[PDB]
Amino acid sequence: EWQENKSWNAHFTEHKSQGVVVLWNENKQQGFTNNLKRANQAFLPASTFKIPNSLIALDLGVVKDEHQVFKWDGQTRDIATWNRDHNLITAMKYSVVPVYQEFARQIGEARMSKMLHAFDYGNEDISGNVDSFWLDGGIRISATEQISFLRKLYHNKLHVSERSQRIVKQAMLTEANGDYIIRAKTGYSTRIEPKIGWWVGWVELDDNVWFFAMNMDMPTSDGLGLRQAITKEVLKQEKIIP
Numbered sequence: 001e002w003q004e005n006k007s008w009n010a011h012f013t014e015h016k017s018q019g020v021v022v023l024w025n026e027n028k029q030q031g032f033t034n035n036l037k038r039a040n041q042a043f044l045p046a047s048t049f050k051i052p053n054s055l056i057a058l059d060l061g062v063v064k065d066e067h068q069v070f071k072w073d074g075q076t077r078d079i080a081t082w083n084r085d086h087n088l089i090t091a092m093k094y095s096v097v098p099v100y101q102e103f104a105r106q107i108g109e110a111r112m113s114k115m116l117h118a119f120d121y122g123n124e125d126i127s128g129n130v131d132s133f134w135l136d137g138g139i140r141i142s143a144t145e146q147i148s149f150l151r152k153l154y155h156n157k158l159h160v161s162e163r164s165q166r167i168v169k170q171a172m173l174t175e176a177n178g179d180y181i182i183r184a185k186t187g188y189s190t191r192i193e194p195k196i197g198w199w200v201g202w203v204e205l206d207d208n209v210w211f212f213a214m215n216m217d218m219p220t221s222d223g224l225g226l227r228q229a230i231t232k233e234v235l236k237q238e239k240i241i242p
Protein backbone atom coordinates (compact mmCIF):
# COMPACT_ATOMS: atom_id res chain seq x y z
CA GLU A 1 0.00 0.00 0.00
CA TRP A 2 1.19 3.47 -1.01
CA GLN A 3 0.04 7.01 -0.28
CA GLU A 4 1.10 10.26 -1.97
CA ASN A 5 1.27 13.42 0.15
CA LYS A 6 2.22 16.36 -2.06
CA SER A 7 2.15 18.67 0.97
CA TRP A 8 5.71 17.49 1.62
CA ASN A 9 6.81 19.16 -1.64
CA ALA A 10 7.11 22.36 0.40
CA HIS A 11 10.22 20.95 2.10
CA PHE A 12 12.02 20.91 -1.26
CA THR A 13 10.40 23.94 -2.90
CA GLU A 14 11.27 26.28 -0.03
CA HIS A 15 14.98 25.60 -0.73
CA LYS A 16 14.58 26.26 -4.47
CA SER A 17 15.16 22.53 -4.95
CA GLN A 18 13.34 19.41 -6.13
CA GLY A 19 13.42 15.87 -4.82
CA VAL A 20 11.58 12.90 -3.38
CA VAL A 21 11.24 11.49 0.12
CA VAL A 22 9.97 7.92 0.54
CA LEU A 23 8.96 6.56 3.95
CA TRP A 24 7.98 3.00 4.88
CA ASN A 25 6.27 2.08 8.17
CA GLU A 26 7.41 -1.47 8.91
CA ASN A 27 4.74 -2.29 11.51
CA LYS A 28 1.91 -1.20 9.23
CA GLN A 29 3.57 -2.13 5.89
CA GLN A 30 2.59 1.24 4.42
CA GLY A 31 4.55 3.70 2.30
CA PHE A 32 4.44 7.50 1.96
CA THR A 33 5.97 9.91 -0.55
CA ASN A 34 5.65 13.49 -1.79
CA ASN A 35 6.21 12.49 -5.41
CA LEU A 36 5.49 9.05 -6.75
CA LYS A 37 6.91 9.31 -10.26
CA ARG A 38 10.33 10.36 -8.95
CA ALA A 39 10.07 7.75 -6.19
CA ASN A 40 10.36 5.20 -9.02
CA GLN A 41 12.92 7.03 -11.17
CA ALA A 42 16.32 5.34 -11.16
CA PHE A 43 19.53 7.31 -10.53
CA LEU A 44 23.18 6.49 -10.08
CA PRO A 45 23.62 5.21 -6.50
CA ALA A 46 27.05 6.84 -6.02
CA SER A 47 28.31 6.50 -2.44
CA THR A 48 25.08 4.82 -1.34
CA PHE A 49 26.62 1.82 -3.12
CA LYS A 50 29.22 1.53 -0.37
CA ILE A 51 26.58 -0.47 1.47
CA PRO A 52 26.35 -3.35 -1.03
CA ASN A 53 30.07 -3.04 -1.70
CA SER A 54 30.80 -3.41 2.03
CA LEU A 55 28.49 -6.43 2.29
CA ILE A 56 30.14 -8.19 -0.64
CA ALA A 57 33.69 -7.43 0.49
CA LEU A 58 32.98 -8.80 3.96
CA ASP A 59 31.25 -11.97 2.77
CA LEU A 60 34.07 -12.71 0.31
CA GLY A 61 36.86 -12.04 2.80
CA VAL A 62 38.20 -8.99 0.97
CA VAL A 63 37.60 -7.23 4.29
CA LYS A 64 38.34 -9.31 7.38
CA ASP A 65 36.44 -7.18 9.90
CA GLU A 66 35.63 -3.58 10.78
CA HIS A 67 39.10 -3.12 12.35
CA GLN A 68 41.25 -4.05 9.34
CA VAL A 69 43.23 -0.97 8.32
CA PHE A 70 43.36 0.13 4.68
CA LYS A 71 46.51 2.17 4.17
CA TRP A 72 46.37 5.47 2.33
CA ASP A 73 48.11 5.06 -1.03
CA GLY A 74 50.05 8.25 -0.46
CA GLN A 75 48.18 10.09 -3.21
CA THR A 76 47.00 13.52 -2.12
CA ARG A 77 43.32 14.04 -2.98
CA ASP A 78 41.19 17.15 -2.54
CA ILE A 79 39.23 15.62 0.38
CA ALA A 80 41.44 15.89 3.45
CA THR A 81 39.82 13.05 5.42
CA TRP A 82 40.64 10.64 2.57
CA ASN A 83 44.42 11.25 2.91
CA ARG A 84 44.78 8.97 5.93
CA ASP A 85 44.32 5.38 7.05
CA HIS A 86 40.78 4.02 7.32
CA ASN A 87 38.84 1.02 8.52
CA LEU A 88 35.39 0.04 7.33
CA ILE A 89 33.77 2.34 9.90
CA THR A 90 35.74 5.48 9.00
CA ALA A 91 35.83 4.75 5.26
CA MET A 92 32.05 4.57 5.57
CA LYS A 93 31.65 7.70 7.72
CA TYR A 94 33.74 9.81 5.31
CA SER A 95 32.51 8.08 2.13
CA VAL A 96 36.08 7.26 1.13
CA VAL A 97 35.80 6.37 -2.57
CA PRO A 98 39.38 5.15 -3.21
CA VAL A 99 39.07 2.55 -0.44
CA TYR A 100 35.91 1.16 -2.02
CA GLN A 101 37.37 1.25 -5.53
CA GLU A 102 40.02 -1.17 -4.26
CA PHE A 103 37.27 -3.29 -2.69
CA ALA A 104 35.64 -3.46 -6.13
CA ARG A 105 38.84 -4.36 -7.98
CA GLN A 106 39.44 -7.29 -5.61
CA ILE A 107 35.79 -8.37 -5.79
CA GLY A 108 35.95 -8.50 -9.59
CA GLU A 109 33.32 -8.21 -12.31
CA ALA A 110 31.98 -11.75 -12.04
CA ARG A 111 31.37 -11.84 -8.29
CA MET A 112 30.10 -8.25 -8.13
CA SER A 113 27.55 -8.80 -10.90
CA LYS A 114 26.37 -12.10 -9.44
CA MET A 115 25.94 -10.65 -5.95
CA LEU A 116 24.00 -7.56 -7.09
CA HIS A 117 21.55 -9.91 -8.81
CA ALA A 118 21.28 -12.04 -5.67
CA PHE A 119 20.57 -8.77 -3.81
CA ASP A 120 17.91 -7.80 -6.37
CA TYR A 121 19.73 -4.46 -6.24
CA GLY A 122 18.51 -1.77 -8.62
CA ASN A 123 18.81 -2.67 -12.28
CA GLU A 124 21.67 -5.02 -11.32
CA ASP A 125 23.81 -3.65 -14.19
CA ILE A 126 27.51 -3.06 -13.52
CA SER A 127 28.41 -2.03 -17.09
CA GLY A 128 31.44 0.26 -17.05
CA ASN A 129 34.71 0.18 -15.12
CA VAL A 130 34.62 -2.19 -12.16
CA ASP A 131 36.23 0.52 -9.99
CA SER A 132 33.79 3.29 -10.87
CA PHE A 133 30.58 1.79 -12.26
CA TRP A 134 28.54 3.12 -9.33
CA LEU A 135 29.78 6.65 -10.15
CA ASP A 136 29.71 6.78 -13.97
CA GLY A 137 28.59 3.34 -15.18
CA GLY A 138 25.23 1.85 -16.02
CA ILE A 139 23.98 0.85 -12.57
CA ARG A 140 20.77 2.60 -11.56
CA ILE A 141 18.47 2.41 -8.55
CA SER A 142 15.32 4.19 -7.37
CA ALA A 143 14.32 5.40 -3.91
CA THR A 144 11.61 2.75 -3.62
CA GLU A 145 14.22 0.17 -4.69
CA GLN A 146 16.60 1.50 -2.05
CA ILE A 147 13.85 0.81 0.51
CA SER A 148 13.32 -2.77 -0.66
CA PHE A 149 17.03 -3.48 -0.28
CA LEU A 150 17.43 -1.87 3.16
CA ARG A 151 14.46 -3.79 4.56
CA LYS A 152 16.17 -7.05 3.60
CA LEU A 153 19.42 -5.87 5.19
CA TYR A 154 17.57 -4.90 8.37
CA HIS A 155 15.99 -8.35 8.65
CA ASN A 156 19.25 -10.20 7.80
CA LYS A 157 17.53 -11.62 4.70
CA LEU A 158 20.16 -10.71 2.10
CA HIS A 159 22.04 -13.67 0.64
CA VAL A 160 25.15 -13.16 2.73
CA SER A 161 25.98 -14.23 6.27
CA GLU A 162 24.28 -12.74 9.30
CA ARG A 163 27.72 -11.58 10.45
CA SER A 164 28.32 -9.56 7.27
CA GLN A 165 24.98 -7.79 7.65
CA ARG A 166 25.48 -7.00 11.33
CA ILE A 167 28.86 -5.42 10.55
CA VAL A 168 27.54 -3.21 7.74
CA LYS A 169 24.60 -2.14 9.91
CA GLN A 170 27.09 -1.20 12.65
CA ALA A 171 29.09 0.77 10.07
CA MET A 172 25.92 2.60 8.95
CA LEU A 173 25.27 3.98 12.47
CA THR A 174 24.73 7.73 12.06
CA GLU A 175 22.88 9.07 15.10
CA ALA A 176 21.73 7.76 18.46
CA ASN A 177 20.05 9.35 21.46
CA GLY A 178 17.40 8.47 24.02
CA ASP A 179 14.66 8.85 21.38
CA TYR A 180 15.86 7.13 18.18
CA ILE A 181 18.71 5.50 16.26
CA ILE A 182 19.51 6.31 12.62
CA ARG A 183 21.61 3.99 10.44
CA ALA A 184 22.09 5.43 6.94
CA LYS A 185 24.41 6.34 4.07
CA THR A 186 24.75 9.52 2.03
CA GLY A 187 25.38 9.78 -1.69
CA TYR A 188 26.46 12.51 -4.10
CA SER A 189 26.26 11.76 -7.84
CA THR A 190 27.93 14.32 -10.15
CA ARG A 191 29.41 12.50 -13.17
CA ILE A 192 26.11 11.95 -15.04
CA GLU A 193 23.16 14.33 -15.19
CA PRO A 194 21.12 15.22 -13.26
CA LYS A 195 23.37 15.79 -10.25
CA ILE A 196 21.63 14.57 -7.09
CA GLY A 197 22.20 13.86 -3.43
CA TRP A 198 21.08 10.70 -1.66
CA TRP A 199 20.24 9.79 1.90
CA VAL A 200 18.91 6.28 2.56
CA GLY A 201 18.46 4.28 5.75
CA TRP A 202 16.04 3.79 8.59
CA VAL A 203 15.04 5.13 11.99
CA GLU A 204 14.85 2.72 14.94
CA LEU A 205 12.19 3.40 17.59
CA ASP A 206 11.23 1.41 20.67
CA ASP A 207 8.46 -0.55 18.90
CA ASN A 208 8.70 0.26 15.18
CA VAL A 209 11.14 1.06 12.38
CA TRP A 210 10.77 3.68 9.63
CA PHE A 211 12.79 3.16 6.46
CA PHE A 212 13.58 6.18 4.32
CA ALA A 213 15.18 6.93 0.97
CA MET A 214 15.48 10.42 -0.46
CA ASN A 215 17.10 12.09 -3.43
CA MET A 216 17.15 15.74 -4.48
CA ASP A 217 18.68 17.93 -7.16
CA MET A 218 22.20 18.99 -6.17
CA PRO A 219 23.65 21.35 -8.80
CA THR A 220 26.35 22.45 -6.33
CA SER A 221 28.02 20.93 -3.29
CA ASP A 222 26.61 23.84 -1.26
CA GLY A 223 23.29 22.06 -0.62
CA LEU A 224 24.59 18.69 0.59
CA GLY A 225 23.42 19.41 4.15
CA LEU A 226 19.84 19.61 2.88
CA ARG A 227 19.79 15.84 2.32
CA GLN A 228 19.66 15.26 6.08
CA ALA A 229 17.92 18.52 7.00
CA ILE A 230 14.94 17.99 4.69
CA THR A 231 14.54 14.33 5.69
CA LYS A 232 14.56 15.16 9.39
CA GLU A 233 11.93 17.88 8.89
CA VAL A 234 9.63 15.32 7.26
CA LEU A 235 10.23 12.91 10.12
CA LYS A 236 9.38 15.66 12.62
CA GLN A 237 6.25 16.63 10.66
CA GLU A 238 5.09 13.01 10.70
CA LYS A 239 5.86 12.85 14.44
CA ILE A 240 8.34 10.03 13.89
CA ILE A 241 11.09 11.92 15.74
CA PRO A 242 10.64 14.86 18.14
Ligand SMILES: O=C(O)c1cccc(-c2ccc3[nH]ccc3c2)c1
Pocket residue numbers: 047079094095186187188221224
Ligand atom coordinates in the same frame (compact mmCIF):
# COMPACT_ATOMS: atom_id res chain seq x y z
O1 LIG B 1 28.32 12.17 0.11
C1 LIG B 1 28.74 13.09 0.88
O2 LIG B 1 28.04 13.66 1.75
C2 LIG B 1 30.17 13.54 0.75
C3 LIG B 1 31.16 13.00 1.56
C4 LIG B 1 32.47 13.44 1.45
C5 LIG B 1 32.80 14.42 0.54
C6 LIG B 1 31.83 14.98 -0.29
C7 LIG B 1 32.17 16.08 -1.24
C8 LIG B 1 32.64 15.79 -2.54
C9 LIG B 1 33.04 16.80 -3.40
C10 LIG B 1 32.96 18.12 -2.97
N1 LIG B 1 33.30 19.30 -3.60
C11 LIG B 1 33.04 20.34 -2.75
C12 LIG B 1 32.55 19.88 -1.58
C13 LIG B 1 32.49 18.45 -1.69
C14 LIG B 1 32.09 17.41 -0.84
C15 LIG B 1 30.52 14.52 -0.18
